[PDB]
Amino acid sequence: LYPTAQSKRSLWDFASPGYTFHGLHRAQDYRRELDTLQSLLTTSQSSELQAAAALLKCQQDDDRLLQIILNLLHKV
Amino acid sequence: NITLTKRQQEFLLLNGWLQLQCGHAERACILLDALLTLNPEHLAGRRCRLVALLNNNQGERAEKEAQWLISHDPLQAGNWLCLSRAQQLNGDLDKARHAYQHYLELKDHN
């Protein structure tokens, strides 16, 4: 019935993809795939794809906002 | 007509997995549904989405996904834990006890 620390560890390990995104420069490669993928999925007519495209646009703009915050914490 | 590169499949997978770690199961499900709409055979994605559905309380979908994985990914204990949780979400408590007992037996693969 209820969960068990063993139950949730088996859940995590089950859901966890492990090492993924196989590349040499995680930061540039991430922003590049995010932008490419977000502009790619809007062109879908599928409701399921359209929702993903919207969420990606979101993190794309939350990253623009955090970039603004990060600049503010550089100067003192 | 849309096709995902390997890196792009990995990207969505990793975004779905990261949102699921944040406790954001709907966001996880949306990302993983898009992946599994275009690459239905992405097993890591099937698993991650299966657990995300179990946390966003989509028991009937979670069920169909768990039996799907059991029929396609075999001897895997986690499939049975997912079936148990999905079955308990659907109110079939006994179906969940049979599924949980199968889970215990293969966790016993040690």
Numbering used by the authors:
A (entry chain B): 47 to 122
B (entry chain A): 10 to 119
Sentences from the paper on this structure:
Several gram-negative bacteria employ type III secretion systems (T3SS) to inject effector proteins into eukaryotic host cells directly from the bacterial cytoplasm. Here, we present structures of the YscX:YscY complex alone and bound to nonameric YscV.
Crystallization of this complex required the reductive methylation of primary amines. The resolution was considerably poorer, with the protein adopting a loose packing in space group I4122 with a solvent content of 64.3%. The overall fold is identical to that of the shorter construct and the structures align well with r.m.s.d. values of 2.033 Å between YscX32:YscY and chain A and B of YscX50:YscY or 1.388 Å with chain C and D of the latter. In general, the r.m.s.d. values were a bit higher for YscX (1.489 Å or 1.383 Å for chain B or chain D, respectively) than for YscY (1.233 Å or 1.078 Å) and the models differ the most in the position of the loop between helices α1 and α2 of YscX and in a slightly increased bending at the C-terminus of α3 in the model for YscX32:YscY. Even though this YscX construct is 18 residues longer than YscX50, only L47-P49 of these are resolved, suggesting that the N-terminus is largely disordered. Moreover, the C-terminus in this model is fully resolved and is helical albeit with high B-factors for the last residues. We found that the N-terminal 31 residues of YscX are prone to proteolysis, indicating that they may not exhibit a tertiary structure.
